[PDB]
DNA sequence: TTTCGGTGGCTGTCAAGCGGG
DNA sequence: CCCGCTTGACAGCCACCGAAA
């Protein structure tokens, strides 16, 4: 009744710009079935997806609720594609008042699953402690739970030009 | 007004299993 | 076997809503 689903008519509708369940819905066949042939065969990971590849943590739900979870993933696709000009207004705006709020009182992101939600947390997990000297251009404190990979480091410093970017 | 946490539903992946070739 | 799917469970993604400033 139609074509078999192969990996380059997803890629190509993907390039199109419809996404995964939208092809699944074209083809009659279940979201996994068109990630399935993705994961397997090679599809192009988005910006977001590479950025979770360097993702420092083990997270489990609900550490996506919390807002320290969503801003440092903001900051990972700003430093991967290298501006703003991808994303939209309240990525952008949302993610200048968190680089603020981290310089001027001097946090960095500190991750250990034991943290149970709190006031300001809503998913729990996380907690802003003092910079230290070792922290160097991190925006997280490395510790015992912390995966930090070569790509980690630029993803989860500082920008370069982050002096000029607040303004 | 605008800011910013909390929230929900949608999107995508992984593991285990099933059926046909 | 292998390859393409489906279930079920879970992790992550992003704009909207409303209170607070």
Request: hydrophobic residues 25%; negative net charge; aromatic residues 6%.
């Given at each position: 009744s139609r074509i078999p689903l192969t990996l380059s008519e997803i890629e190509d509708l993907r390039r199109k710009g419809f996404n995964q369940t939208e092809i699944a819905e074209l083809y009659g066949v279940t979201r996994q079935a068109v990630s399935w042939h993705k994961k397997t065969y090679g599809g192009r990971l988005t910006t977001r997806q590479i950025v979770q590849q360097n993702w420092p943590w083990d997270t489990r739900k609900?550490?996506?609720?919390?807002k320290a979870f969503q801003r440092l993933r903001d900051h990972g696709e700003y430093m991967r594609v290298?501006?703003?000009?991808?994303?939209?207004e309240d990525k952008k705006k949302r993610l200048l008042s968190w680089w603020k709020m981290l310089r001027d009182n001097d946090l960095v992101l500190e991750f250990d699953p034991s943290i149970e939600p709190y006031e300001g947390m809503a998913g729990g997990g996380f907690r802003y402690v003092p910079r230290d000297?070792?922290?160097?251009?991190?925006?997280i404190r490395v510790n015992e739970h912390t995966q930090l990979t070569a790509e980690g480091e630029l993803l989860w410093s500082w920008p370069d030009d982050i002096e000029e970017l607040l303004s």
């Open positions: 609900p550490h996506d609720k919390s290298g501006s703003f000009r991808t994303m939209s000297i070792s922290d160097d251009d991190l925006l």
